[PDB]
Design an enzyme around this catalytic site. Structure first.
Site, PDB file in Angstrom:
ATOM      1  N   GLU A  60       0.838  -1.174   0.000  1.00  0.00           N
ATOM      2  CA  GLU A  60       0.000   0.000   0.000  1.00  0.00           C
ATOM      3  C   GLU A  60       0.892   1.248   0.000  1.00  0.00           C
ATOM      4  OE1 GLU A  60      -3.114   1.678  -0.800  1.00  0.00           O
ATOM      5  OE2 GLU A  60      -3.872  -0.055   0.317  1.00  0.00           O
ATOM      6  N   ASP A  88      -2.336  -5.266   0.653  1.00  0.00           N
ATOM      7  CA  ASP A  88      -1.707  -4.192   1.437  1.00  0.00           C
ATOM      8  C   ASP A  88      -0.274  -4.556   1.857  1.00  0.00           C
ATOM      9  OD1 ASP A  88      -4.012  -2.434   1.525  1.00  0.00           O
ATOM     10  OD2 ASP A  88      -4.869  -3.730   3.043  1.00  0.00           O
ATOM     11  N   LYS A 114     -15.057  -7.744   2.598  1.00  0.00           N
ATOM     12  CA  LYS A 114     -13.736  -8.049   2.073  1.00  0.00           C
ATOM     13  C   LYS A 114     -13.640  -9.496   1.562  1.00  0.00           C
ATOM     14  CE  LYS A 114     -11.162  -4.356   2.936  1.00  0.00           C
ATOM     15  NZ  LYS A 114     -10.383  -3.722   1.851  1.00  0.00           N
TER      16      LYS A 114
HETATM   17  O1  LIG Z   1      -3.990   4.192  -0.520  1.00  0.00           O
HETATM   18  C1  LIG Z   1      -4.825   3.594  -1.229  1.00  0.00           C
HETATM   19  O2  LIG Z   1      -4.320   3.025  -2.217  1.00  0.00           O
HETATM   20  C2  LIG Z   1      -6.265   3.650  -1.017  1.00  0.00           C
HETATM   21  N1  LIG Z   1      -6.969   3.430   0.285  1.00  0.00           N
HETATM   22  C3  LIG Z   1      -8.436   3.536   0.362  1.00  0.00           C
HETATM   23  C4  LIG Z   1      -9.241   3.395   1.526  1.00  0.00           C
HETATM   24  C5  LIG Z   1      -8.847   2.624   2.613  1.00  0.00           C
HETATM   25  C6  LIG Z   1      -9.662   2.509   3.760  1.00  0.00           C
HETATM   26  C7  LIG Z   1     -10.885   3.179   3.856  1.00  0.00           C
HETATM   27  C8  LIG Z   1     -11.340   3.987   2.792  1.00  0.00           C
HETATM   28  C9  LIG Z   1     -12.550   4.677   2.880  1.00  0.00           C
HETATM   29  N2  LIG Z   1     -13.229   5.014   3.993  1.00  0.00           N
HETATM   30  N3  LIG Z   1     -14.272   5.659   3.683  1.00  0.00           N
HETATM   31  N4  LIG Z   1     -14.337   5.754   2.497  1.00  0.00           N
HETATM   32  N5  LIG Z   1     -13.307   5.178   1.902  1.00  0.00           N
HETATM   33  C10 LIG Z   1     -10.491   4.072   1.653  1.00  0.00           C
HETATM   34  C11 LIG Z   1      -9.145   3.841  -0.811  1.00  0.00           C
HETATM   35  C12 LIG Z   1      -8.532   4.045  -2.040  1.00  0.00           C
HETATM   36  O3  LIG Z   1      -9.293   4.294  -2.987  1.00  0.00           O
HETATM   37  C13 LIG Z   1      -7.112   3.954  -2.149  1.00  0.00           C
HETATM   38  O4  LIG Z   1      -6.533   4.160  -3.405  1.00  0.00           O
HETATM   39  O1  LIG Z   2      -7.077   0.649  -2.456  1.00  0.00           O
HETATM   40  C1  LIG Z   2      -6.951  -0.127  -1.476  1.00  0.00           C
HETATM   41  O2  LIG Z   2      -5.869  -0.744  -1.334  1.00  0.00           O
HETATM   42  C2  LIG Z   2      -7.947  -0.219  -0.492  1.00  0.00           C
HETATM   43  N1  LIG Z   2      -9.179   0.417  -0.740  1.00  0.00           N
HETATM   44  C3  LIG Z   2     -10.211   0.393   0.215  1.00  0.00           C
HETATM   45  C4  LIG Z   2     -11.458   1.016  -0.014  1.00  0.00           C
HETATM   46  C5  LIG Z   2     -11.846   1.541  -1.257  1.00  0.00           C
HETATM   47  C6  LIG Z   2     -13.106   2.143  -1.397  1.00  0.00           C
HETATM   48  C7  LIG Z   2     -14.004   2.240  -0.326  1.00  0.00           C
HETATM   49  C8  LIG Z   2     -13.648   1.722   0.925  1.00  0.00           C
HETATM   50  C9  LIG Z   2     -14.453   1.776   2.031  1.00  0.00           C
HETATM   51  N2  LIG Z   2     -15.657   2.332   2.143  1.00  0.00           N
HETATM   52  N3  LIG Z   2     -16.026   2.125   3.415  1.00  0.00           N
HETATM   53  N4  LIG Z   2     -15.114   1.503   4.037  1.00  0.00           N
HETATM   54  N5  LIG Z   2     -14.161   1.278   3.250  1.00  0.00           N
HETATM   55  C10 LIG Z   2     -12.381   1.125   1.042  1.00  0.00           C
HETATM   56  C11 LIG Z   2      -9.972  -0.273   1.427  1.00  0.00           C
HETATM   57  C12 LIG Z   2      -8.770  -0.908   1.715  1.00  0.00           C
HETATM   58  O3  LIG Z   2      -8.659  -1.466   2.814  1.00  0.00           O
HETATM   59  C13 LIG Z   2      -7.754  -0.891   0.747  1.00  0.00           C
HETATM   60  O4  LIG Z   2      -6.554  -1.522   1.036  1.00  0.00           O
HETATM   61 MN   LIG Z   3      -6.729  -2.523   3.037  1.00  0.00          MN
HETATM   62 MN   LIG Z   4      -4.882  -1.645  -0.213  1.00  0.00          MN
END
Ligand SMILES: O=C(O)c1[nH]c(-c2cccc(-c3nnn[nH]3)c2)cc(=O)c1O
Ligand SMILES: O=C(O)c1[nH]c(-c2cccc(-c3nnn[nH]3)c2)cc(=O)c1O
Ligand SMILES: [Mn+2]
Ligand SMILES: [Mn+2]
Length: 174
Positions: A60, A88, A114
């Site tokens: 990540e 990740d 997930k």
């Molecule tokens: O660092 C990333 O690559 C990453 N992490 C996230 C991510 C991870 C944990 C939670 C959330 C989230 N929370 N609420 N909405 N999105 C988003 C979303 C991405 O689209 C993304 O490109």
């Molecule tokens: O881009 C990722 O690597 C990614 N994205 C997400 C992600 C992406 C879009 C929405 C959310 C989300 N919405 N609500 N909680 N998480 C989470 C979560 C992860 O744990 C993660 O490792």
């Molecule tokens: Mn994750």
């Molecule tokens: Mn990720």
């Protein structure tokens, strides 16, 4: 306020990383403040996890080219199936990829989301309540390592609530 909190309460390196993960893909961190806050938290967890071993590869927080390069290089030298989505971490000691979940909801609900979204990837889920869930209940790390993480998440929750930001944040999860 949510933005102020993010900038004030997270490592610059992480804020810089969170902002790119958004700004390339068009999301504004000044407007999606809660997503910004979330991405930061998830990054911090990933790094923390990654640090407490060189046991773990951090996948990540890299750009896509690097992440897939890192994934391919791990797959050529270990023989482990290549996942469809970027996870990740990789665990060189157990020889499995790890998917890290942080949830404002209940852990079993985020676990299922997930697990459903993917197959041989180990899942670990942290909440802001010090609750965790992991495939085959195999929590990968020692207790001390899992306590620093939990404390830190809880601390973030408690800081958010000091600034009357938690309620907003809690409710903006899927
Ligand atoms: O660092 C990333 O690559 C990453 N992490 C996230 C991510 C991870 C944990 C939670 C959330 C989230 N929370 N609420 N909405 N999105 C988003 C979303 C991405 O689209 C993304 O490109
Ligand atoms: O881009 C990722 O690597 C990614 N994205 C997400 C992600 C992406 C879009 C929405 C959310 C989300 N919405 N609500 N909680 N998480 C989470 C979560 C992860 O744990 C993660 O490792
Ligand atoms: Mn994750
Ligand atoms: Mn990720």
């Amino acid at each position: 306020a949510m933005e102020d909190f993010v900038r004030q309460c997270f490592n610059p390196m992480i804020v810089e990383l969170a902002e790119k993960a958004m700004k390339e893909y068009g999301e504004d961190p000044k407007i999606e403040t809660n997503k910004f806050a979330a991405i930061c938290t998830h990054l911090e967890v990933c790094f923390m996890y990654s640090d407490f071993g060189h046991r773990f590869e951090i996948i990540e927080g890299r750009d896509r080219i690097m992440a897939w390069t890192v994934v391919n290089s791990i797959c050529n030298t270990t023989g482990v199936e290549k996942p469809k989505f970027l996870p990740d971490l990789y665990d060189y000691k157990e020889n499995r990829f790890i998917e890290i979940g942080v949830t404002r909801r209940e852990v079993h609900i985020y676990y299922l989301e997930k697990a459903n979204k993917i197959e041989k990837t180990h899942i670990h889920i942290f909440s802001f309540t010090g609750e965790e869930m992991a495939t085959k209940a195999d929590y990968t790390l020692d207790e001390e390592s899992r306590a620093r993480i939990k404390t830190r998440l809880f601390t973030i929750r408690q800081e958010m609530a000091s600034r009357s930001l938690w309620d907003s944040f809690r409710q903006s999860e899927r």
